[PDB]
Each structure stands twice: as C-alpha cells, then as structure tokens.
Amino acid sequence: GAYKYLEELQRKKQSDVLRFLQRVRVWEYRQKNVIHRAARPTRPDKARRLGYKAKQGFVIYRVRVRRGNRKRPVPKGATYGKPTNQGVNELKYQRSLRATAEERVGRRAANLRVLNSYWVNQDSTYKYFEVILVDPQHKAIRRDARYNWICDPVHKHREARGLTATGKKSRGINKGHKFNNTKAGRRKTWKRQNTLSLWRYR
Amino acid sequence: MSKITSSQVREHVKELLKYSNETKKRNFLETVELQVGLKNYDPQRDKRFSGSLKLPNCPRPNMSICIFGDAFDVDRAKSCGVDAMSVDDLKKLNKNKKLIKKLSKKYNAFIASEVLIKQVPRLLGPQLSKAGKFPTPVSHNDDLYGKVTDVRSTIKFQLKKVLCLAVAVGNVEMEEDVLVNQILMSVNFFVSLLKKNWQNVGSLVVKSSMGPAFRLY
Amino acid sequence: DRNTAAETFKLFNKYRPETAAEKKERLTKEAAAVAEGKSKQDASPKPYAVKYGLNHVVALIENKKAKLVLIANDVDPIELVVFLPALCKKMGVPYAIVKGKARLGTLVNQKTSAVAALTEVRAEDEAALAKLVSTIDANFADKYDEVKKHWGGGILGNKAQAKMDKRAKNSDSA
RNA sequence: GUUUGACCUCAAAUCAGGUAGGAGUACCCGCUGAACUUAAGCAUAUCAAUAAGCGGAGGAAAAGAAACCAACCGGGAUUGCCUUAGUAACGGCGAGUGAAGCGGCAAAAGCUCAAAUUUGAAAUCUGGUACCUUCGGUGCCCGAGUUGUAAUUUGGAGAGGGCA
RNA sequence: CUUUGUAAAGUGCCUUCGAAGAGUCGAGUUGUUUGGGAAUGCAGCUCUAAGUGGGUGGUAAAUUCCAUCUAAAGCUAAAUAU
C-alpha cells in the first residue's frame, strides 16, 4: 500500500521535497478563491484516515482562514470596563482556525455535513484546510450502513455545535483528572455544581 | 562494521609481521601498539583519573629484568635471567647521580616482596616520577612463572597536562585474534574512566616498532 | 522517449484487463461448467493481464513479483508517486517513467491509472519484455544513482534569458 | 502544420433530481461577554467563566466504551442522585471561591474505521429505462471508481500457512 | 409456504507474522481560564518529535526503575434536564 509511504513522507515537512511542494501549492491555493472546491483530496491518505471514501456523495472543500490573534471588535480600542478586561490585541479565539475553516464551509455548502477537516498548507497571513463533507441526501451515503448515521438530523451542523474533532478538542472533551472543568460539558458541569438540590425530607 | 575494520586490520597484521623491506625485519618480536582517537580532549584541570587498567593478554614490553625483593626471590628466580641485588646496595647505587638514570632508562621490569615494599620509596621514588617503571606485589615462595605475563601486562595510563597516551596491543609471537580482541577491550577499558567513545571506535594503528604509510582513522 | 514508449505500449496492449463483456461471457461458461461436469477453478484458463492500481502494484514491487513497472509523470498530487522510482530501484524491479497517465488509463480500461505493472507474461512474449526491460534500465534504473544527485528547474523566462545573455556579453565579450 | 480521440482542471444551462435558509427555544451544544454588586474605600479578586449579543440540534441534548482511576488483596464506557465536602486546593492567602478518586444506589450494551495483494478476475455504488409484488425488487444501459468502491481485520485482538 | 447451502459463524494445538491516526504529540512564549498551586484546560505565534514507542502518575530538573493506560479518526438507547 502506497498509503503508508504517503503517511511517512508527509510527516517530514522540511524534507527538500515537501519544502518545494509547500511553496508551489500555497501559491496555487492563494490564486484561487478563499473558500473554493477541490476536485480530489491533496492528501488522499490523510483524508481516508479521517473517514473520507472515494464514492459519490463525499466531497472535499479547500478553505483559507486569516492567521493571527482575535482583535476585540470594540471601537477605538475603548472597552468600558475594569483594567482586567481592557485587553484588545493579545487576546485569543477559544475555537481553533480548523474550527473557523469548518464553520465557513458549513455555511457555504449547507446541504452537506462536515465529517472531518485537516491541515494542508500555511503561509504568514493564511492557513489552508481541506474539509471532508458528505451528502446526507445522496442514496450512495443513505444506503451504506457505515455512513447512514450522518443523515440522522441530530448530526445537522456538527461543526457549529462543536462535535467535530476540532470542537471536541476546543471543548476539552477527554477522560481524566486533566479535564475536570470540561469533561461532560463545561456549562453542564458549572450549573450541576451550582445547583442547590433539596429533597422532601432534608 | 561488526568487529571494526577486521578486513583491513588483518592486512595491518600480515603486511607488517612478515616483511624485510617495509617493516625492515629487525632482530626481535616486532611489538605492535596503538594510541587513541577522541573529541574528549579537554586537557583536564580535573586531573584525569589515570587508572592502571589490566588484561591477562600480554603486550610483552619484556626485555630488561631486575629485582628489589630479597631473601626468597634471589635464590628462587636465580634459575631465570634475573641478577640478585642485596639490601645494602641502593644507597651506593643512588649515591652517584648517573647510576639511577641508567637503571630507570634500561631496567623496565622489577620484582618486589611484601617485606621489600618498605625500604623502596625514600631514594628511588621521585628521581624519575614519570618513567612508569615500578615493581608489583608477588609473594616470597609463590608461582614465579605466572609473573612473566601478570606484571608486564599491567602497562600505564598516566594522562597529565596533555591528552597524549598509547596502550600497547600484544606482539608477534602472541595469539593472532587476541590482539584484535584486546584492542576492542582497550577501547572499553578507556571509556570505563572516559564518557564518550567517538563512537565504539578509537583511531586504528598497529606499528610493530615500525609504522609504514598505512593511511587508519 | 517516444520509440521505447511506443514499443512498451505495443507489448502492454496485450494483457489488457478483461472487458465487461469478455468477463460476463467467461463467467457464463465457468458458472455453467459448475453444473455441467462440476469442474470449477480449472476451466477459464489462468489470466495474463496487466497489474494496475497504486496500492496493488506497490505491494507487488515490495514482494518483488513485478518484471516491468510504468510510472506516470503527471499524477495530480506528485507525492503519490515521488517514492516509487526509489522503492522500485531498492527492490531491483525494472521500471520506466512513461508519458501519459491517460495513456496508461486507456491501456487498463479506466480514465487514468497513475501506474502499470507486468508481473507475468506469455512464453512467446517474454523475449520482447526482456529486451524492452534492458533498454528502459539503460535510461532510468542504471542512471538513478546519478539523477538522484542533480536538481531540475532554476530556469529563467525567455525575456530574462535574453537580458542575462546581453549582460554577460557586456563585461566578458566587450 | 493537420485528422480524430482521450485526459486534467474550470465553466454554462428556466439541464434530470434533490437539498439549505425562517420560526420556536423551557431544557441542550457552542461562541462572545459586561457592569451593578461584594470587598464596609479601590485597581487584582468578586458578581461570573453569569445577563445581554450571535451560531447550531433534538425529544431530549451532550457524553460515552479509556492515551481513565489508582498504588489496592487493585478497580473498569457514559450520565444522574446520596456521599466525599464547604474538604484537598485557590486567593490584595483579605473578601471570597472550591473540585476529584474510592463508597451505596438509578440504568446498563456495546462497537466502527485507517493502516493488508480480490489481484485466478471492482467482487462495489448512484443514475436512466423497462417490467413487477413498489419505504422496494429484477433485467439491460450510461456513469462513479484502481489517485481504491466491496469481502476480511480493530488491539479485548487479529492475519497468513499447517494438522484435528 | 419454504430453504437458505453448498455458505456463513464460534471453538482447540503448532508456525511465521502482528500494519494501529503529524504542523500532530510535546516544548517555549502571549492571552485567557481552572481549586489545579515553576502553570487545569483552551487558543494564537516560533520550534517540532519518536517507535520498546507516546501520555499520565496533582513541586521544577538530572540519573535509575516501576505502575497504568494506547492520543492525535468515528457510531452508540436507559438512568439526567425541561
């Protein structure tokens, strides 16, 4: 299988080969639109590891989100608060750039469902992602049992609610002492241990 | 590569030990030796260990014999080529300046006793201090015929002020594979006190008292 | 080059993978003979077809069963194929970079194949394979160790070529 | 320089069939985000990871079958209650905040891909058309697809080969 | 009424194997957040692994062991909210 040789090669990103390819592709992508389509996966081994298949219904969409921090949208930098919240510049978005890229493609192509996104390329002002989406309306996907589940309307806009790999990361949904605040849901956990639970006999 | 350079070290033995023009075919055992090859060359203001490591294999720096231990070894080893020196002698020996110079310039093998390691260090002691020329513990009434290897196999490791040392590796009449095994052991018993090897490697050479143009590290 | 390529494709024109019709008819004979005689897997004589598909031929090269591997020069993400000449050499299978994945695709009844491989051959046509393997080994296999060292590109546009040729004739050819 | 045909990428159409918005929002998943207030003042803290604002679901949602807890004679997905505990910890160590494991109980149920040569046979799938027994079925025909669609394998395993 | 079927599943001993997810893990730094305290999670930027490997073991590091899991892909009712 060529897929193992692809997987191994793609890790060595500063090997003379990938150095060259990074420089020429990042040019090709920058010349196309922001959110444009992709005729095939640029990384067919990475795609299929995340769950892409080469059957009708599955699509790929290339997307480029601006890099850098989140500047607070307050006008003239004036915040109207206490010094602790006078921050404007050094502030970070709590979701990732993968999440922003997933979110904007989800809005563009609303008929399809985001299966999984991933990193392709980056320069100084851009990061380049390829979102694997699925057609929940195409019989091809509705008839196969391994991808029948995605069609169920409890999977509508996974990328928005934050149920994709990126969302689950950004929401710290992981087992262990490390993720005590955010394991079952940060908000659910907060209100549970801020709930005063009284019985009939106290 | 799997016994380092044993393809060219066998050439280094055979194309030296049997030659009358290159190696010059001199008198006696063409005695083969080797220096070291390292990056571990900080001159050591730490005062480098200088540990006298040993192996039962014989380098055989064995021409010049003497004796200091008396009353047993004199009349036990008189059979051998040793020449007995009595107890009232080393005073008259070192009384004139030159006698001790000749002694520690030529006399490179000594036998002592557990009673004659008392009157040793006063006179001879620091007259040389760096010749690497001293006796070793052997009993009064003992083997005497295991000493031929066990004493002269113990050669010296004094590495003070500069990183310039060389531990000799057998000679001609010794075993053929044992010298190419003891070189690897001599690297191992160097990296005993050292920290780096550079790396499972020294810097090969087997000058059998003549070093031709074998240019190996 | 376009005469070694022509001859390679003339040998590879035979061992074309069974068509949808030829498959159906062979299956109708076999499946009928499972009833009439009850002699299955001996009827429908052994197929000599070209081996194709990337993950198939990669494994045939890794197992050293391939006798000639054609590597396309215009695969959409080159990375799919960048490793294949180097793998093909290390295993010691004779390989050639041939012009057209479309040309390979037309040979295997697909649109594009990105790779082809002759692992077996008929006794009649082993002589041609042996010759064409020697003539492609002259170009690719033998010279791999040298071509491995040397870079492509770094080539100016025709207008900047003409400018450099002017600015070089300025100083030296004054 | 032509003959015809491919391929790749990108288009067009009041093209065959389809799908997205909006509403609602008690509960749920996210983002963004204060100040009043408390500190007898106040700037960190606090209110609060709250109100407001925006994106997104369902009858529940989310979570979930370990990159867990532990240090035991070890437990064994997830969630909830009782408890741990107003504790360990945090904190102008001020005001104040503040979990988790074990334990009893409620309900319990597990699994799927990628990475393998089907290679003595893309075995796979959408579509169109006809007929039927019509949440579909079958024949034929175009297409998807080898830049990998099926069968097999999921770590507890398991695969190939051997014998019974 | 059939009838799948000549095709699928579990089970024992031997022999070779036994793939297991990368701008990720992790590290520095900035901001935020947490009870998490030389840093609990999250995020931006720079660097960026490995294969007896990686994470964790609630005081930073070095050397030595040990224990425990198997990350960076995914599906899943009920007990809960209203």
Add this chain to the structure above:
RNA sequence: UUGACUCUAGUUUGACAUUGUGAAGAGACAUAGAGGGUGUAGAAUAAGUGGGAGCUUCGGCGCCAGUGAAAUACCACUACCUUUAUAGUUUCUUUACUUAUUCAAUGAAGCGGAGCUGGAAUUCAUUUUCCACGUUCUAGCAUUCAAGGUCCCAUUCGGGGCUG
C-alpha cells in the same frame, strides 16, 4: 484637567516567521601533508605517548660506553603555530537574479530578441561592430480588408490561401 496611580487603540524600534536564488572577501568540516617547539647535560636541536638490540643492496645511528625527566637513529599517531588546492553551510557584509510578496495601468495592441531597408560603420561591398525605422504651416477628412499574385465557381456568382 494634568510628570496623580493603573492601563489601552495608535504609532514606532528589534527578533522570529512569510523568505527563495546567485557572485566577491571568510568558518573547514569529512579529505589531505611539508614545515610546526634548544631550562638541563649532551656530538647536537628531545612538544609529546607508547617500541626496542640490530638493521641497511651499499651509506647512517641505536645495541651498548655515554648525558639527562624525556634515546635519539628507524618510524607510527595526538594535538600545539602555518601554507591551500576540496566547493562538503551563512557564520557576517558588499552587490546581483525573478519566481513568492508588493504597487500601479490597459476595454491586457504592438513586449522582448532577431531580421530587414538602413544612409552608413570607412580599414577598407561584413559574417567586425557604433549607427533610425511610414505621419507637422492650416479648427477638413480617415470606419465595411484594394492592388498584385494562386486554387477552386466550368468559369455565372463570387467566396477563399499568403502577402499587403
């Protein structure tokens, strides 16, 4: 409102990233090989660590007499100064290349190189290199390929090749 305490949009400076590719000075590094050191007695000039009793076709010194810490000669190898001739990285500074990036403009028309005609360069009519490329007294006009040439239209109707 301000040299009150604490911050901040902005702006500016540095580092890193975007950030590639060459040339003239340099670190050589794998890669060499000639010098490259006289405290002491001593033939005399021992940086050293390990060798030794005879070699060399003849010469020459050790062996041993000998001085001194270092026994020479006969050589290996380790660095401590030097030479450069490997083209094995920017290591730092002086220029250059387009292709990333960047700023324009056009309804993307004439760009670049060469060739004609130059009229000529005189070294002399050239395979030598310097030397332009249809519009000017005037408030007019300039648009549908005309001239030659070649095949078809059976020589009707004209439409087509290349020049222009």
